[PDB]
Amino acid sequence: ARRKRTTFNKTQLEILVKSFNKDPYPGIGVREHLASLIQIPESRIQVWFQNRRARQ
Amino acid sequence: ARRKRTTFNKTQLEILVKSFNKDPYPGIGVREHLASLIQIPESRIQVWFQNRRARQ
DNA sequence: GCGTAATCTAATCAACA
DNA sequence: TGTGATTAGATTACGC
Numbered sequence: 001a002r003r004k005r006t007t008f009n010k011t012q013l014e015i016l017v018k019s020f021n022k023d024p025y026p027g028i029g030v031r032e033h034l035a036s037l038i039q040i041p042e043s044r045i046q047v048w049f050q051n052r053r054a055r056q
Numbered sequence: 057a058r059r060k061r062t063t064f065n066k067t068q069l070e071i072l073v074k075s076f077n078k079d080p081y082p083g084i085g086v087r088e089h090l091a092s093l094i095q096i097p098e099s100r101i102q103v104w105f106q107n108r109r110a111r112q
Numbered sequence: 113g114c115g116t117a118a119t120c121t122a123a124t125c126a127a128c129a
Numbered sequence: 130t131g132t133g134a135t136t137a138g139a140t141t142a143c144g145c
Binding site: 058060061063081084102106109110 | 134135136137138139141142143144145
């Protein structure tokens, strides 16, 4: 009943890690910007940031 | 900065409440179906279902 | 002003590879 | 066999 597991390539992961090192708590504007930049739904990016902050 | 508060009209709330009374833990397919039906992003519908289960 | 949409942490599951 | 997705609790704080 779960969604298909989202896959991130090297460029998307690099951009996400750069934005995370800049700010671990991005606002809705920055999340929407990343969503339009790397072509990933914004909810997926919010989940990615939450998982990242959880692991560290 | 937070996202703008999503607004639901009477019809959207009615459809969501009927689907909730049918199944409080909808799969990704039903959430995407409701998203296409009432024209609301699927993440918003998942959040709505979680908040509903949270009240009840 | 209240109801409830939104966001976070802590925990757990499971899918693609 | 080894990280994205989901859930439950707390909270903050807009829209109507």
